[PDB]
Amino acid sequence: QVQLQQPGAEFVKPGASVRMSCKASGYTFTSYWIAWVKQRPGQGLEWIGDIYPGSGYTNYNGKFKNRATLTVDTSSNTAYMQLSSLTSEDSAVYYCTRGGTTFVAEPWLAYWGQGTLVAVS
Amino acid sequence: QVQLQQPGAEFVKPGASVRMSCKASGYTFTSYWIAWVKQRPGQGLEWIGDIYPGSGYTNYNGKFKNRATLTVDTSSNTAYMQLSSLTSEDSAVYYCTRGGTTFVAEPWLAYWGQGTLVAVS
Amino acid sequence: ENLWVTVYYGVPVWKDAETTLFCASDAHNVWATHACVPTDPNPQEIHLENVTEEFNMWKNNMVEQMHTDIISLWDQSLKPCVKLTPLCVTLQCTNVTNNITDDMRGELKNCSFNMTTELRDKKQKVYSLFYRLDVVQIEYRLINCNTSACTQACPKVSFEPIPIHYCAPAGFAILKCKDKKFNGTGPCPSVSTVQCTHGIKPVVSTQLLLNGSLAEEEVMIRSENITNNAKNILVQFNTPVQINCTRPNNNTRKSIRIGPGQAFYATGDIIGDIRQAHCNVSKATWNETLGKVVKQLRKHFGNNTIIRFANSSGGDLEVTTHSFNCGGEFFYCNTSGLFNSTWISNNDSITLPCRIKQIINMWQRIGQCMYAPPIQGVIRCVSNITGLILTRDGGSTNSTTETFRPGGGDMRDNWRSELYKYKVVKIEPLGVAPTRCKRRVV
Amino acid sequence: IRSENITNNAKNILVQFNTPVQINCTRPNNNTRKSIRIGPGQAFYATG
Amino acid sequence: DVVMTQTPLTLSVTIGQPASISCKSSQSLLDSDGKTYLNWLLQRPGQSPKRLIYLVSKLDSGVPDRFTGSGSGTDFTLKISRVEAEDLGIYYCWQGTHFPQTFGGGTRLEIK
Amino acid sequence: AVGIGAVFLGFLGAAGSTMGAASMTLTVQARNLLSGIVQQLTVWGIKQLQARVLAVERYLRDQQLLGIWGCSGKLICCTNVPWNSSWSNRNLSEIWDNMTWLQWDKEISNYTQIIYGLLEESQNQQEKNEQDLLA
Amino acid sequence: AVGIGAVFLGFLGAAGSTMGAASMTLTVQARNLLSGIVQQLTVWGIKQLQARVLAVERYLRDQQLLGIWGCSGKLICCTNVPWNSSWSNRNLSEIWDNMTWLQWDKEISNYTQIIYGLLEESQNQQEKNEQDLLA
Amino acid sequence: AVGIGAVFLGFLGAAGSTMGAASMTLTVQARNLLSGIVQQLTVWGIKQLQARVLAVERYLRDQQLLGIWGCSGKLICCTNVPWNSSWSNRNLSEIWDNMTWLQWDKEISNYTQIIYGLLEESQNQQEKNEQDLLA
Ligand SMILES: *[C@@H]1O[C@H](CO)[C@@H](O[C@@H]2O[C@H](CO)[C@@H](O[C@@H]3O[C@H](CO)[C@@H](O)[C@H](O[C@H]4O[C@H](CO)[C@@H](O)[C@H](O)[C@@H]4O)[C@@H]3O)[C@H](O)[C@H]2NC(C)=O)[C@H](O)[C@H]1NC(C)=O
Ligand SMILES: *[C@@H]1O[C@H](CO)[C@@H](O[C@@H]2O[C@H](CO)[C@@H](O[C@@H]3O[C@H](CO)[C@@H](O)[C@H](O)[C@@H]3O)[C@H](O)[C@H]2NC(C)=O)[C@H](O)[C@H]1NC(C)=O
Ligand SMILES: *[C@@H]1O[C@H](CO)[C@@H](O[C@@H]2O[C@H](CO)[C@@H](O[C@@H]3O[C@H](CO)[C@@H](O)[C@H](O)[C@@H]3O)[C@H](O)[C@H]2NC(C)=O)[C@H](O)[C@H]1NC(C)=O
Ligand SMILES: *[C@@H]1O[C@H](CO)[C@@H](O[C@@H]2O[C@H](CO)[C@@H](O[C@@H]3O[C@H](CO)[C@@H](O)[C@H](O)[C@@H]3O)[C@H](O)[C@H]2NC(C)=O)[C@H](O)[C@H]1NC(C)=O
Ligand SMILES: *[C@@H]1O[C@H](CO)[C@@H](O[C@@H]2O[C@H](CO)[C@@H](O[C@@H]3O[C@H](CO)[C@@H](O)[C@H](O)[C@@H]3O)[C@H](O)[C@H]2NC(C)=O)[C@H](O)[C@H]1NC(C)=O
Ligand SMILES: *[C@@H]1O[C@H](CO)[C@@H](O[C@@H]2O[C@H](CO)[C@@H](O[C@@H]3O[C@H](CO)[C@@H](O)[C@H](O)[C@@H]3O)[C@H](O)[C@H]2NC(C)=O)[C@H](O)[C@H]1NC(C)=O
Ligand SMILES: *[C@@H]1O[C@H](CO)[C@@H](O[C@@H]2O[C@H](CO)[C@@H](O)[C@H](O)[C@H]2NC(C)=O)[C@H](O)[C@H]1NC(C)=O
Ligand SMILES: *[C@@H]1O[C@H](CO)[C@@H](O[C@@H]2O[C@H](CO)[C@@H](O)[C@H](O)[C@H]2NC(C)=O)[C@H](O)[C@H]1NC(C)=O
Ligand SMILES: *[C@@H]1O[C@H](CO)[C@@H](O[C@@H]2O[C@H](CO)[C@@H](O)[C@H](O)[C@H]2NC(C)=O)[C@H](O)[C@H]1NC(C)=O
Ligand SMILES: *[C@@H]1O[C@H](CO)[C@@H](O)[C@H](O)[C@H]1NC(C)=O
Ligand SMILES: *[C@@H]1O[C@H](CO)[C@@H](O)[C@H](O)[C@H]1NC(C)=O
Ligand SMILES: *[C@@H]1O[C@H](CO)[C@@H](O)[C@H](O)[C@H]1NC(C)=O
Ligand SMILES: *[C@@H]1O[C@H](CO)[C@@H](O)[C@H](O)[C@H]1NC(C)=O
Ligand SMILES: *[C@@H]1O[C@H](CO)[C@@H](O)[C@H](O)[C@H]1NC(C)=O
Ligand SMILES: *[C@@H]1O[C@H](CO)[C@@H](O)[C@H](O)[C@H]1NC(C)=O
Ligand SMILES: *[C@@H]1O[C@H](CO)[C@@H](O)[C@H](O)[C@H]1NC(C)=O
Ligand SMILES: *[C@@H]1O[C@H](CO)[C@@H](O)[C@H](O)[C@H]1NC(C)=O
Ligand SMILES: *[C@@H]1O[C@H](CO)[C@@H](O)[C@H](O)[C@H]1NC(C)=O
Ligand SMILES: *[C@@H]1O[C@H](CO)[C@@H](O)[C@H](O)[C@H]1NC(C)=O
Ligand SMILES: *[C@@H]1O[C@H](CO)[C@@H](O)[C@H](O)[C@H]1NC(C)=O
Ligand SMILES: *[C@@H]1O[C@H](CO)[C@@H](O)[C@H](O)[C@H]1NC(C)=O
Ligand SMILES: *[C@@H]1O[C@H](CO)[C@@H](O)[C@H](O)[C@H]1NC(C)=O
Ligand SMILES: *[C@@H]1O[C@H](CO)[C@@H](O)[C@H](O)[C@H]1NC(C)=O
Ligand SMILES: *[C@@H]1O[C@H](CO)[C@@H](O)[C@H](O)[C@H]1NC(C)=O
Ligand SMILES: *[C@@H]1O[C@H](CO)[C@@H](O)[C@H](O)[C@H]1NC(C)=O
Ligand SMILES: *[C@@H]1O[C@H](CO)[C@@H](O)[C@H](O)[C@H]1NC(C)=O
């Protein structure tokens, strides 16, 4: 089964950093795109970013002015994300969703995980 | 006032050299062109050469086959000319005249000086 | 109608970048060595109008580039001649009392030693005269013996200063300001560019600049943060003040063979009287020159302050005294007479007792050294004083009656007075311009 | 077990483990160093 | 960029009635290849997001008969014949042709 | 009338003139990127090699860069790519004949990679269209 | 739809894709032939010079080679040269969209000099006709 | 008829033939400016680097020179610039098919810079006219 394991919840402090992991299992990690999604309970879904688990090419949303650094590991089949140093109002849950292939790209948002609760306090 | 000071008269010998100076005062020397003119009493005015007290670019008359070396000094606001090693029949007065700007170039021959009597003997 | 982009190549653009320069010398030696490519005698200088540029004195890499460059030349020139390893033998020395002036009593020390000869199985007794600042009691040994032993200046390769031209590689340009009021750092509305700089003499000094390039119109006090006393103040004069230096002794040179094809040159026996080396500077000229310096200096400080001058604040002989390399023989000279005055708001020479030290320690890199062999006969010097390198004394209360003393001595500051105008920039030919372009589609 | 021709005994066999085995090495002596000058600006350091 | 707005902010429905929801695109989403990659996902209240329609003409696995995706160009719609507790939620229309891959504004289905 | 805004204003001479008048001086600028060290031990031996290689490498990077864009072999070339007007809401007369080039590059230096990020895509796209017409 | 077969597949990334899909990735390949050593004693001093010169020389040989063929300045260029059909009796669809490029070059590596032996002759010819039309 | 005045006359082989017959041998000449040292301590280490860099630098100077003139990418290219007839009052048949090229360059070597002094001006002038038509 295609599953994207995520940590349960992380409690961080202002001025600190986080290591937002996203495990890949039950498929080939070197082809499918990986993207992150925000699910603020009081707001609609927002596009955070996208990391290509192959060439390492990174793309970032316009509103973010490259505030995050995205890293992946092809050996352990994992993906990582930096914030970097977010603040209080950005305390919500992020979902690491699997995209499609760089050729077809139609199956985007095929599978999701459970997310992780980021509550900086 | 725009003035082009020149030496009064120089008496040189065959096989010798001259340092034909031309002082610049009362204006900006880095822009206006500088040219020399001959005023043989028995003959009409002749074009000698032209120096740009700028890039240092030098142009010479076709009849001169580059017999002269032109030098300028942007620090002391002066212009110099070599003959080089002229002969008897070229004994006359040379005038260092100020030209116009490289862009407009309409005010050419705007101002003159007094010249210097070159009499090689 | 909506404008498009166009590619422009070669358009003038400047970016602040610094790289390795190149050397050029005018038509053996230590500086040029007939190795640098000759520079054509047409230094085409071009004036750029309607432009201003920024110059960062004390941050230019040209100063750093020259400082490391000449040291490499010094090491390169010292390798191919005799080492002086076997001169650290015990020195049984004695005083010199044959026609000795009272002012130099005990300075020279007649010495004898058992230094080896060319044959490895034979010795020889050789006597030589050494200055007091070259030996130390244990009876005597050389000052540098407990430190790494040094070579001997190849007798033939003179260290006489030679102007050196610095030229940047293709794709880079050198910009020089021309405003006569130029401070240490700031825009200059008379920017100009030249591929090669004018002749720069690497002549050395610690207190008084020698054979430097004088200012244009007025004395300039070029300095970064001035309220901070920790950094030196560099002063450049406008009219040279002639300085005379001479060695009155009629010294003679003796050649001693140390090994196979390796010879060492010693001092003595001296001929004639024993007179201290002295330097001379006109009294009237110096007073006028100092008066002009304080006048311009008073524009940066209080007008009613009583400016005073004093000698250095003590320390090692290398930095405490004036130094120069005239005629290949080094002089360390006490300049207490050039700063003994006070200035309140509103006979033809000075005798400067000098000193000589044949054993020379170069830049404060302590692992190196060299020997300076003597030269037959008297040596005369004629140089120009172009400026001073003063230092600001601390502890001033209420900033009143401020005083300065000579000091510094770092070799970088000497060249900074010559490289302050010149900076290196990079050319960015590529560019994009917006206009109404429609490419001809095939 | 990374190796070229294996039936040939003349070539070494290279083995790479998967879990590190800690190794401890120590010198129990409390040695001291003595500096002896050998020449001009040249020093040699001895034992004891 | 191309915004995704949905007319129904609140949709009051009782069990056993047909529900209507629609979405709009500022610019036509017809891709050069000749397909519309728009996705209609019904995000559960607290569970992981789940897609319901991809390639709006096509439908996902575990097909529910009530859901019938339709629409092309500027207009997108999804008709549900009957309402179930699962239907009660938030629907998002996600474009899949332009950058960024913006989601829908969200239409809430609640009983009042 | 021998004085025309032209090459004899000097290498880098157009840097003080307006952008429009600097277009005719783009030939004196490409010539001074290779020569100057034509005429000719560790010190000054490696330095000469390092300087020469860097000068050659620097010029090639631009020649290669113009090669990908398809503008190589033309000193002044333009493609069909449009640009986001938000970068500079200025008129042609407000860019070329009223301001120097030196400060112009400073303002737009932020989008140098972005504007480059559109040139090569169009050139390859142009080649693909030519391939389609070619076939 | 941000995932399109394009540059972001990575340098050399198209080596695993079909020949047809690799055409759009030819721009990411030319960019990585010069840079990488922009930022900077015998060891590593001569080596840096040797590596830099070799990289510069290698790129020149191709730029020169494309210059003689007349394809310089166009990343994807072609001439009017026919080729001996015996080299590869395959259809366009049988070459581009069904096999990778890596094994392709191996098969026709034998005739690399021969196929090159026809490009320059025609380019010089094409110049000759232009000269005839020119005159 | 295998013997045609062509490449197989040898590198520099056309130097003995007339100028007209030497035009077809201009491809064997550009190939021998870079290669020859492809296959590979102070002596012969620095010398190899100095020789390689000089060969690369020399070739680039001509490539850049042709680039400014706008003839780059074409082995035989000509602009629209006229020339002062006083330099050589000779007919086409009196230049190409009756005299060798070696002694030719000697006679007109005096005006090499002057004739070059017109090529770049026209090329930039050509670009400016294209800019006018472009706009
Ligand atoms: C500041 O600049 C002035 C201006 O040059 C400079 O004065 C120069 O000093 C040198 C050194 O004394 C003079 O040249 C010497 O002249 C004497 C007398 O003729 C010669 O005996 C010297 O020959 C020795 O040195 C040679 C190498 O230089 C050896 O090859 C030779 O065998 C001798 O050992 C030497 O030529 C020079 O004439 C003056 N210049 C002028 C214009 O007077 C002064 O030294 C500079 N300041 C400093 C601190 O260097
Ligand atoms: C030290 O300072 C003195 C001035 O106090 C300098 O003397 C000056 O030297 C220059 C040449 O270096 C003289 O200019 C020359 O004049 C002759 C004609 O006499 C001319 O043919 C040359 O082309 C050059 O222009 C200048 O007249 C002279 N001034 C005085 C008052 O003597 C001396 O050169 C300085 N020395 C050093 C090493 O800095
Ligand atoms: C540098 O030179 C100066 C003078 O040119 C040296 O200063 C001199 O130092 C001596 C020794 O102290 C002074 O002599 C003594 O002065 C005291 C003062 O009260 C007096 O009581 C003694 O009888 C004796 O004369 C001498 O006056 C002084 N010179 C001046 C002009 O004041 C200085 O020591 C030298 N420094 C170095 C490092 O060589
Ligand atoms: C440096 O800046 C000054 C600013 O005054 C420039 O002065 C102006 O220069 C132009 C040409 O060099 C002069 O002529 C003008 O030319 C235009 C275009 O041909 C024409 O339309 C005008 O009617 C005028 O004739 C102009 O009179 C002069 N003064 C101004 C503008 O007030 C100078 O040219 C600049 N130099 C450089 C090298 O950039
Ligand atoms: C590596 O090789 C595998 C072999 O299976 C490739 O899998 C195929 O990849 C393509 C596109 O990446 C998938 O989509 C196909 O696209 C073509 C052209 O648009 C279309 O006509 C087909 O109908 C299909 O949609 C295809 O489903 C997939 N599976 C196959 C061919 O069995 C994979 O793409 C290769 N990856 C790389 C990077 O070369
Ligand atoms: C070296 O110089 C000799 C000078 O005699 C050349 O001899 C001539 O060579 C040509 C061709 O190589 C011979 O054929 C001629 O060709 C022209 C043009 O196709 C044709 O119009 C003539 O009717 C004739 O067939 C020619 O007979 C021969 N003898 C002469 C000119 O007296 C020789 O070719 C030169 N070789 C080289 C490599 O430059
Ligand atoms: C430097 O100046 C001093 C001081 O004037 C000179 O000393 C003179 O030396 C001569 C002997 O040559 C004596 O006759 C004078 O009496 C001394 N002067 C004084 C005031 O005592 C010295 O000669 C000068 N040296 C140089 C090289 O100029
Ligand atoms: C410095 O030394 C010189 C030479 O020993 C003294 O003589 C002057 O020499 C220059 C030539 O270099 C002449 O132009 C001067 O006319 C000479 N002056 C006199 C008075 O003869 C010079 O006087 C010395 N100056 C000082 C201040 O000691
Ligand atoms: C600077 O000058 C002062 C003059 O006041 C020197 O002070 C004398 O120094 C000597 C030895 O150098 C002592 O014997 C005296 O007792 C000191 N007297 C006074 C009043 O200070 C000082 O030594 C000089 N220092 C330097 C570095 O030149
Ligand atoms: C030698 O001179 C020194 C200098 O102070 C002196 O102390 C010593 O007594 C002198 N010795 C003789 C023998 O003259
Ligand atoms: C040199 O050798 C002689 C002869 O043995 C001896 O008397 C003298 O003390 C020696 N001198 C030194 C400094 O060793
Ligand atoms: C060498 O001896 C002198 C004499 O006092 C001393 O000042 C210096 O520090 C010594 N250097 C070393 C390295 O021992
Ligand atoms: C030069 O720099 C100093 C130090 O920043 C500053 O005070 C001064 O105003 C500047 N200009 C001049 C002409 O000194
Ligand atoms: C040094 O510079 C700083 C700012 O550049 C200034 O505030 C200060 O007064 C200056 N002087 C000292 C002693 O710090
Ligand atoms: C030095 O002493 C030796 C030995 O007595 C003597 O021969 C020589 O003349 C002396 N030299 C001087 C300058 O006094
Ligand atoms: C130097 O100038 C000062 C300034 O007033 C004066 O007091 C002093 O007497 C002058 N000295 C000489 C030697 O002229
Ligand atoms: C000192 O006086 C001069 C005029 O002699 C004046 O320009 C300057 O401002 C004065 N200094 C101060 C700090 O006011
Ligand atoms: C300064 O010169 C005067 C002149 O007689 C003298 O009395 C005084 O001691 C000197 N001071 C110094 C520090 O040289
Ligand atoms: C030094 O003395 C010797 C002794 O003969 C003499 O030949 C020479 O000329 C003297 N040197 C000077 C500069 O007087
Ligand atoms: C070595 O390799 C060869 C062939 O590669 C094989 O026949 C042979 O059995 C191997 N072992 C020895 C000992 O030669
Ligand atoms: C406007 O800017 C965006 C990025 O901010 C870019 O994607 C778009 O292409 C630009 N518009 C044009 C017409 O180039
Ligand atoms: C360009 O970027 C700099 C820093 O990256 C920023 O300070 C400046 O405001 C930017 N300018 C524009 C026009 O975006
Ligand atoms: C066929 O191959 C021969 C050499 O074997 C070659 O000469 C000929 O040109 C080829 N045919 C074509 C159409 O290129
Ligand atoms: C290519 O050449 C190799 C060796 O030169 C040969 O083994 C192979 O069969 C050749 N292939 C073709 C298609 O000619
Ligand atoms: C004739 O020669 C002159 C220089 O002597 C030159 O200016 C002119 O352009 C030449 N004629 C032609 C048509 O090129
Ligand atoms: C070419 O120049 C040389 C020397 O510069 C001269 O001897 C010769 O006559 C000139 N030839 C022509 C045709 O101008």
XYZ file of C-alpha atoms in Angstrom, chain H:
135
model
C 38.392 11.394 -61.901
C 39.431 11.194 -58.251
C 41.958 14.035 -58.503
C 40.155 17.313 -57.818
C 41.692 20.374 -56.219
C 40.398 19.652 -52.739
C 41.341 18.894 -49.130
C 43.712 16.030 -49.937
C 46.220 18.542 -51.346
C 47.309 18.751 -47.705
C 47.326 21.184 -44.812
C 48.841 24.425 -46.143
C 48.891 22.668 -49.523
C 46.961 25.450 -51.253
C 49.739 27.936 -50.425
C 51.354 26.998 -53.746
C 48.164 27.226 -55.798
C 46.300 30.275 -57.053
C 43.945 32.176 -54.770
C 40.855 30.925 -56.593
C 41.838 27.273 -56.220
C 42.712 27.838 -52.543
C 39.139 28.755 -51.560
C 38.038 25.104 -51.437
C 40.948 24.251 -49.093
C 39.868 26.585 -46.271
C 38.386 23.737 -44.187
C 41.607 21.741 -43.738
C 43.150 24.921 -42.296
C 40.737 25.639 -39.434
C 40.905 22.043 -38.168
C 44.650 22.148 -37.382
C 44.521 25.103 -34.952
C 43.451 23.277 -31.754
C 44.173 19.535 -31.946
C 47.560 17.789 -32.015
C 48.239 17.820 -28.253
C 45.133 15.932 -27.125
C 47.140 13.072 -25.594
C 49.438 13.753 -22.644
C 57.728 18.214 -12.624
C 58.523 21.672 -14.025
C 60.104 21.114 -17.450
C 57.440 20.244 -20.061
C 54.760 20.813 -17.408
C 54.565 24.594 -17.571
C 55.601 24.498 -21.234
C 52.609 22.306 -22.083
C 50.294 24.688 -20.224
C 51.844 27.758 -21.861
C 51.581 26.249 -25.347
C 48.011 25.016 -24.851
C 46.770 28.336 -23.462
C 48.431 30.319 -26.254
C 46.860 28.105 -28.923
C 43.433 28.473 -27.306
C 43.905 32.223 -26.841
C 45.042 32.761 -30.436
C 42.046 30.936 -31.910
C 39.585 32.794 -29.673
C 40.961 36.146 -30.838
C 39.944 35.323 -34.410
C 36.598 33.872 -33.306
C 35.863 37.029 -31.320
C 37.113 39.138 -34.230
C 34.729 37.386 -36.620
C 31.960 37.706 -34.033
C 32.206 41.497 -33.938
C 32.167 41.660 -37.747
C 29.023 39.504 -37.779
C 30.635 36.840 -39.989
C 30.985 34.299 -37.165
C 29.547 30.875 -37.915
C 30.262 31.257 -41.647
C 33.671 30.205 -42.942
C 33.314 32.430 -46.033
C 31.324 35.584 -45.260
C 31.310 39.107 -46.676
C 29.644 42.327 -45.552
C 28.309 45.263 -47.600
C 31.248 47.589 -46.873
C 32.948 49.103 -49.945
C 36.716 49.550 -50.041
C 38.930 52.369 -51.276
C 39.831 51.334 -54.818
C 43.281 52.938 -54.505
C 44.497 49.991 -52.406
C 44.513 47.592 -55.381
C 43.481 48.655 -58.898
C 43.165 45.101 -60.193
C 40.446 43.008 -61.817
C 38.887 39.889 -60.317
C 40.554 37.686 -62.934
C 43.800 39.575 -62.249
C 43.689 38.665 -58.527
C 42.272 35.160 -58.129
C 43.409 33.016 -61.078
C 46.858 34.483 -61.815
C 48.709 34.977 -58.508
C 49.364 33.123 -55.263
C 47.902 34.251 -51.946
C 51.206 34.274 -50.045
C 52.639 37.391 -51.696
C 49.154 38.933 -51.771
C 48.937 39.531 -48.019
C 52.334 41.257 -48.087
C 51.155 44.039 -50.408
C 47.958 44.880 -48.487
C 49.335 44.227 -44.987
C 49.682 48.009 -44.625
C 45.904 48.566 -44.549
C 44.974 45.519 -42.449
C 43.923 47.721 -39.531
C 42.286 50.278 -41.834
C 40.209 47.663 -43.663
C 39.321 46.194 -40.272
C 38.468 49.747 -39.203
C 35.485 49.691 -41.580
C 34.080 46.189 -41.004
C 32.937 46.609 -37.394
C 31.454 50.055 -38.057
C 29.252 48.660 -40.829
C 28.206 45.638 -38.757
C 27.103 47.851 -35.869
C 25.459 50.166 -38.401
C 23.691 47.132 -39.878
C 22.416 46.197 -36.415
C 21.182 49.750 -35.817
C 19.200 49.674 -39.066
C 17.747 46.322 -38.016
C 16.860 47.960 -34.698
C 15.063 50.725 -36.609
C 13.175 48.186 -38.723
C 12.764 46.110 -35.559
C 11.064 49.040 -33.812
